Amino acid sequence: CGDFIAKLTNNTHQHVFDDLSGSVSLSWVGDSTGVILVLTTFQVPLVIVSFGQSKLYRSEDYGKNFKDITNLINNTFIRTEFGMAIGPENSGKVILTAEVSGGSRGGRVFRSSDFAKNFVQTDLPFHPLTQMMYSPQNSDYLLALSTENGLWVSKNFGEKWEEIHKAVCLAKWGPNNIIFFTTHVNGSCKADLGALELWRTSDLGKTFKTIGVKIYSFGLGGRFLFASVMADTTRRIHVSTDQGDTWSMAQLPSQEQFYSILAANEDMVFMHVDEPGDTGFGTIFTSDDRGIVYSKSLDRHLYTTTGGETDFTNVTSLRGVYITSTLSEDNSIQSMITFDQGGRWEHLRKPENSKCDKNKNECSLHIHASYSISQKLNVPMAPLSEPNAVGIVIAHGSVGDAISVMVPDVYISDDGGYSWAKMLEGPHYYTILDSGGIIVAIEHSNRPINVIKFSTDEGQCWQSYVFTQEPIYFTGLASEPGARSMNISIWGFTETRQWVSYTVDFKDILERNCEEDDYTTWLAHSTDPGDYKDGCILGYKEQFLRLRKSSVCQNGRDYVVAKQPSVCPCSLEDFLCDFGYFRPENASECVEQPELKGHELEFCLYGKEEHLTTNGYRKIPGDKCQGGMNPAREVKDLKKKCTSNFLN
Amino acid sequence: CGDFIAKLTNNTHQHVFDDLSGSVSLSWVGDSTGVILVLTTFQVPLVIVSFGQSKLYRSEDYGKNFKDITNLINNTFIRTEFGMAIGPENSGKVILTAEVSGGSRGGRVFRSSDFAKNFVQTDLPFHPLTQMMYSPQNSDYLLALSTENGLWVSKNFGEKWEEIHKAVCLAKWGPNNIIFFTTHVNGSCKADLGALELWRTSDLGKTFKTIGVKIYSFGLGGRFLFASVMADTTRRIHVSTDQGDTWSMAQLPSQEQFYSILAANEDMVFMHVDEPGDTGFGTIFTSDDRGIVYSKSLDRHLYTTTGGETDFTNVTSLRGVYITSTLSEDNSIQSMITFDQGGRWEHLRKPENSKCDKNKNECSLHIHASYSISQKLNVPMAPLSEPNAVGIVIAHGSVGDAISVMVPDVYISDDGGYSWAKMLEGPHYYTILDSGGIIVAIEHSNRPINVIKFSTDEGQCWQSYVFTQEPIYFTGLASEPGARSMNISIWGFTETRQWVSYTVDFKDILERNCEEDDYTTWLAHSTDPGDYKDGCILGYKEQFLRLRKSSVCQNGRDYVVAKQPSVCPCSLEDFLCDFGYFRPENASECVEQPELKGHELEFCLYGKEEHLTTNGYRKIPGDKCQGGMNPAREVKDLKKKCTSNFLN
Ligand SMILES: *[C@@H]1O[C@H](CO)[C@@H](O[C@@H]2O[C@H](CO)[C@@H](O[C@@H]3O[C@H](CO)[C@@H](O)[C@H](O)[C@@H]3O)[C@H](O)[C@H]2NC(C)=O)[C@H](O)[C@H]1NC(C)=O
Ligand SMILES: *[C@@H]1O[C@H](CO)[C@@H](O[C@@H]2O[C@H](CO)[C@@H](O[C@@H]3O[C@H](CO)[C@@H](O)[C@H](O)[C@@H]3O)[C@H](O)[C@H]2NC(C)=O)[C@H](O)[C@H]1NC(C)=O
Ligand SMILES: *[C@@H]1O[C@H](CO)[C@@H](O[C@@H]2O[C@H](CO)[C@@H](O[C@@H]3O[C@H](CO)[C@@H](O)[C@H](O)[C@@H]3O)[C@H](O)[C@H]2NC(C)=O)[C@H](O)[C@H]1NC(C)=O
Ligand SMILES: *[C@@H]1O[C@H](CO)[C@@H](O[C@@H]2O[C@H](CO)[C@@H](O[C@@H]3O[C@H](CO)[C@@H](O)[C@H](O)[C@@H]3O)[C@H](O)[C@H]2NC(C)=O)[C@H](O)[C@H]1NC(C)=O
Ligand SMILES: *[C@@H]1O[C@H](CO)[C@@H](O)[C@H](O)[C@H]1NC(C)=O
Ligand SMILES: *[C@@H]1O[C@H](CO)[C@@H](O)[C@H](O)[C@H]1NC(C)=O
């Protein structure tokens, strides 16, 4: 790689908080408002009334000075489990949900509509079981669940509440202020698992519509509405794209299996299926634009026995990139990555400049996510990435040795995960701001720390800055919202403990705007060899930018050239495997599954028996390729009517 | 209350361990053998083959010096989940279960029959899924479950392994070397919940017997065998006292409720039943000497929604004493204690000399146990008691303030939980040795520590001793086994971390034997007023001893006078409430349940319809009172045969 102190010392702002008990929370509120709220919270069970008092501080000068405003919430306290209830980014809505320290017949909330500058008190006609839920369509609409399983809505932002149903088990918002929720009759929700009923409301609670029966669970994802249904006993999954008017059971090749949705968009659906026997690993399947017909996409996917957590991450810094973790035939764990939205996975390339090279399964990079947390491994954070920071991925990774599993390191990718480099030794808390101009990490240890590690050139070069002469036990790291933000907030405590917050500003470090000479063009990776598809991602070609090495300048432009997307010709990577086909390890072409050979491929689609005839290729939902490779397929109707639905 | 340093500094033995990875475990092996093992373990998923090496140190001088014996276990490693497998106290058996560092087709064990002084290496014909399991009747027999759900046994202390059944979900030893397990057929055990089968072997695996069908789960306790059965769907609990030859369904007063067993011994059985509605509280029922006929004992019993953990605790330091935590009418958590084996519960007396006196529910002592851990409160250890140390109880407690909940304190009872006293500020790890003569505790914090707190007068006076000028981060505290043990072991590390263990010996502190002038007589508490039953516990009267205040002497005698138990006359406290009756709050007499008044009390006992007629009193199983109060009851047979069994 290859003065910076005075730039940060003049912009390091400290503030000490005295006599704080319990857990300490800190949240910037909105973009470029200077509002930071610090909140004391306490771990108290939900059905218990306890005596306690939450301290509440508000800054309006970007972490310089804080004003105690606890008088606003006198005689109340905030559960850690709840915390704050911030709304959308530019909505200025902030709710604080609390309980009356003496106890009351109802909860008490503090609603702000001006980025926490002025609050009004409103007492609740119930005890809230779960936090407030904003409608994504309308910040003024709110709902939450009572401790008596009652569903409460407000049309005027928590001022006037109305109870709309009394037997509710779960409730989640939908598009256009539609609310879905399960209900029952006999006893408890835990008792009537498999006999619930799924309802829908288009009128905030005026009218209802029962969309389903014999329900075990439900959930949302992208343009899909999911519901697990029990026929008696066995359990099967159904999907609807029309907010529950019409359903169809999901169709898989190859009983008594357990299902799990991994993600979903406006395009497709990732579903994981445990291998019979509950062996510890399963199979991922991918759906079409309707989310009905599923095909094998990745074998031997690890999941935690208790919980089902998986290393599956949606890499936000590159479209159509997902990384997960799988079990090799030698029973060594491997990180897999797809660049074509689950069309074809590839082993994660070992990191350059780290020649481990003994055993072959050894020295492979494993990236740590939700499975690795679940196995109680020393991983402070999941893989982090921001949409604005194209190509930048930061995560925790390990070599094939049990010593490196106990002490993971921080790796950085600049190309959506194609190439990796160990950048920090040992675990760290990281965050991304400035649209990727600034990368800040902070060591995670049992000893007090006082070292900020940051990076201005997309993680390629790092530098350390001691922000205080008094090391503090680390507690939290918050970044200011905004694409061009340069303000962070670190808080912790000393040793009766004394909390303290430092607001560091990178204004004087990044004062010069970057010119075109500080950027360097680079294309995304394409699994298909040759230049003819170099940079093609689901049929679109886009050129990218990147900060040079040791670049210390403020970016004002987006990393996409925004010239024009040129359409690429269709190739293998632009197609998923069809129903009954899969791609074997390291392989590029799809082949029929062994157990289905010589048998007629049949499935059931919206109460119809359908016969499939393919070359084994299905266009990727969302792929925009044209011309080139064009594998055919046909879906003809049959005679039988079949039964593809277990609800009405 | 009202020199001690030289007595401990000369007896503090430090040993430094260099270059250790992973978790560190430390254990004494046997009574007065001076064998201490130290083991390195690693957090690796069970299904993964990883490369690793577990370090292993033996001391045979009670902690003074340790010999690295890792070469005994070269090229293997031990999982943290497995740790050691120590047999019975005086058996001398030690197993070390490990996996081959490269991966293998079996595990590999290291067996020792001589208090860990010599080990033999044996390879397993299977990957162990669960740790080894000794038979309580014969320490030579072991058994274990393989990763392929294979049940394996050994009649010759893990030397020769034999697979006796291949579809085993769970298996558990029994009296006289009998083995219980569950089997299935279709798919996984997770898929055959409610369709399992319960089997039994008296011949270590030669002969089998299917004792129950349609099984959900099962367990052992005291002289009872339990088994949750599914009817279709609904779930009911069955009990058998004859190792599974004849069963009966449990009989409760007052559908689709969730059952749980709390404890059970050679006399009676404690059951918890979630209130319909999964409201976060339930109701405790006790049985008779046959484990069938249940009767309300404590209402509004708190349980954790996810997992069902409760605060129930068996004060093994006093016969007939148990403590748990209930939800008052004021939604405040309260500790409730019984001194008559669940016959009549009483609020836990607030501590003296701590005149908190604001609110009535406030200043109530809440004792933290399993429910409080489930709720993730800052509680390092549960209540601790030793049957050798009569009356001694130590645990973690709180006032009704949310601040005090966050930082619990440690309280002490010398009278079996009748009276309590705040003795230490803040959470601590604590432990008991010398049969109550020495009580040691260690601060629980983020900062490294170097201070031991100990007490030589059964918790009444305390004293600190700084055992090292090099503070260390705390990890573990172990005592030497024995009735008169005086050696402890403290281990932790500095900051690449460096582990270190200190063996402190209280020989020079307790050199003078206690005479009779150092003891003071005291009787146990009896709920019934008056002296005529003062000291009566389930019909037996026994006088107790106690060390005076500020007593620093070595006890050589047991705290029970062992004169002779005099039988007490029967009173209320010596009777449980009958079927359909209960004792209300603060109340002494049993009354019929409201919903059963005017209705004929009927239940079903071993396929018989039985009609009950009582005054509402049932002799306590194990109560030895004679004469005095004698409430009658009658159980007459009827005409109907009824159906009290779902397993054939
Ligand atoms: C990131 O941090 C910088 C601080 O280095 C923030 O800049 C601060 O912006 C406020 C806006 O209120 C400045 O206060 C005043 O704004 C009024 C607007 O009428 C203006 O007339 C005054 O002259 C003054 O600028 C504040 O001075 C400025 N900070 C410093 C240290 O000067 C910035 O807003 C933060 N967040 C981002 C970039 O979103
Ligand atoms: C998986 O991650 C990718 C990026 O990692 C996510 O892709 C992003 O999806 C969102 C919503 O589909 C897109 O937002 C867009 O907002 C504009 C605002 O005007 C709107 O007009 C568009 O209709 C769309 O909603 C976003 O552009 C897109 N990212 C990129 C790079 O294009 C994806 O949603 C994540 N989850 C999946 C695939 O389920
Ligand atoms: C832990 O406590 C024990 C007592 O509970 C201390 O006892 C030590 O025991 C050993 C024997 O294992 C004594 O050594 C000798 O035993 C032989 C017989 O084999 C005998 O002929 C000798 O006369 C002698 O007794 C040793 O003396 C004894 N230690 C002391 C200080 O007397 C043990 O020392 C305690 N742990 C620590 C770390 O001090
Ligand atoms: C609460 O703790 C007490 C501690 O005593 C539990 O144990 C019961 O204790 C007595 C005395 O130790 C046991 O005596 C038995 O002695 C015979 C021979 O004299 C022996 O064969 C037995 O194996 C046993 O040691 C009694 O059986 C024991 N209960 C059990 C589980 O065996 C009491 O069980 C605990 N609370 C409950 C109600 O579970
Ligand atoms: C696939 O390629 C990887 C290296 O990229 C190699 O370790 C593995 O053995 C190959 N597997 C097969 C089945 O070809
Ligand atoms: C029971 O006694 C406790 C104090 O031991 C008291 O606080 C409570 O109000 C009493 N309740 C009833 C119903 O008598």
Numbering used by the authors:
A (entry chain B), B (entry chain A): 53 to 54, 58 to 287, 290 to 311, 314 to 416, 420 to 557, 561 to 713
What does the paper say about this structure?
Sortilin can trigger internalization of ligands from the cell surface via endocytosis and sorts ligands between several intracellular compartments, such as the trans-Golgi network (TGN), endosomes, lysosomes, and the secretory pathway. Previously solved crystal structures of s-sortilin revealed that the Vps10p domain in fact consists of three domains; a ten-bladed β-propeller and two 10CC domains (10CC-a and 10CC-b) that have substantial interactions with the β-propeller.
We determined the structures of the glycosylated luminal segment of mouse sortilin, s-sortilin, from crystals grown at neutral pH (pH 7.5, one crystal form, 2.1 Å maximum resolution) and acidic pH (pH ranging from 5.0 to 6.2, three crystal forms, maximum resolution ranging from 2.3 to 4.0 Å). The structures reveal two distinct conformations, a monomer at neutral pH and a dimer at acidic pH. The eight independent s-sortilin molecules in the three crystal forms grown at acidic pH all form homodimers with an identical interface and highly similar structure. S-sortilin dimerizes through the top face of the β-propeller, i.e., the large side of the β-propeller disk opposite to the bottom face at which the 10CC domains are located. β-Propeller blades 1, 4, 6, 7, 8, 9, and 10 are involved in dimer formation. In the s-sortilin dimer the C-termini are in close proximity to each other with 37 Å distance between the two N713 Cα atoms. The s-sortilin dimer structures, crystallized at acidic pH, reveal that dimerization is accompanied by a substantial conformational rearrangement within the ß-propeller and two 10CC domains. Despite three internal disulfide bonds in 10CC-b, the three α-helices that form a small hydrophobic core in the s-sortilin monomer change their conformation into a three-stranded β-sheet in the dimer. In the monomer conformation, the s-sortilin C-terminus is exposed and pointing away from the β-propeller; whereas in the dimer conformation, it is interacting, through conserved hydrophobic interactions, with the rim of the β-propeller at blades 4 and 5.
